Amino acid sequence: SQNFITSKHNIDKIMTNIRLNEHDNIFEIGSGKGHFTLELVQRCNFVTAIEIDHKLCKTTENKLVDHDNFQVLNKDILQFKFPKNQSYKIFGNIPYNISTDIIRKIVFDSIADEIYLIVEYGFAKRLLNTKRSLALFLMAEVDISILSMVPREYFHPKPKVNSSLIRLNRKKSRISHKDKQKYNYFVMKWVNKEYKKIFTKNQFNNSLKHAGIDDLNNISFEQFLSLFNSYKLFNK
Template sequence: MNQNIKFTQNFITNEKLLSNIMKQINIDENDIIYEVGTGKGHLTSKLAEKCKHVYSIELDKKLYELSSNKLQDNSRVTLINQDILQFNYPYRKKYKIVGNIPFNISTQIVKDAVFRSQASEMYFIVEEGFYKRMIDTRRTLSLQLQTQVYIQQLLPIPAGSFHPKPKVNCILIKLTRHISDIKDKHKKKYEFFISKWVNKEYSKLFTKNQYHQALKHARIKDLNKISYEQVLSVFESYILFNPRK
């Protein structure tokens, strides 16, 4: 990751906006929070006011030292100088994840939080285009994430709210964990299915007759307008037609 701060992070320092963000984040005095990116500690401080403890992970040495000085007297905050992509989230513990995350590694951060943590809720400030990709069922990322979490838009954040100002607007989103839609024994099969489905390689999944039956059962009339639930229905048909694969 580029160590130059101005190329990796965009900070929110406006008190009114920080307060609005906090109103959207569902935390209380019993919650443990893992924050992705301490930055300059503005959001960290707000989180610590409401929750039991904040573990904030920051890779950039300068930002880590800056925030350490700022938050050294706050007993509710533990700062960790580490790459979030190398960080191991706790196992069998209750916690939530919050972060204003760098645009260039948004995919890795979100996938790690969803698939390598046990957080019940995740709140991320992301680039608007990335959020749209997360809910686009024509994309692999969306079909992976939605098997584990509900994806919700909470608050639009204009580009002018950040320093330095990015070229794009952002959104505060919420990911709420639910019981996996895919059984463990079918996970590899699902990954194969969505890789072919997204690339429109339907003939590698179904015969022509099976394909039409699957679409009919899922009530799909337009392949460009398919809900996640309809994709799951097609996958269920794929399992029925291919029990031994």
């Protein structure tokens, strides 16, 4: 059930959009046959490949024979403990079934200042959709941008849908550690339209007009923050 991108011609097309340089240390999520890995090692300063499947760790190693700036840890990305005092970036052509868990792991339990992932086209659209809780929790920590479309033919087994190469850039968190829970509760209550649990009937009108929200079915992350902030004001 794991797919791969093994056409160099295609890999180069995708590297074209990935701006990683010679001095960055990179953590790749799932080396697979080592195709993207082979390019990263040449492209970057050092690559720590994290592959769960042990046979693939081997293949990754055979692939990277004429190279030294890498290591292949046979671990589970979800259980990995990233450095807490180093500057590193992340890349990964990750599986659909655990996209949410991986992205959450690397954005909340890692300090990579720049993350490059390939995910399903739809799932990418969702990461930017202010109507879903994931996008909202994520936008407090990173800026999300879709760089290009990865045709399903580039993959094998050929999936039923296309994919997108996306980029997550770290930013000074917009949500203080103090507001950790308030923001969480508020995000969940708002996405579920359970407005009354977070705003009285008037607090809600003022908050929307204050944030300048005309279409309540289409709001910017910046507007949403306004809402959250008003929310804080109203409750001590």
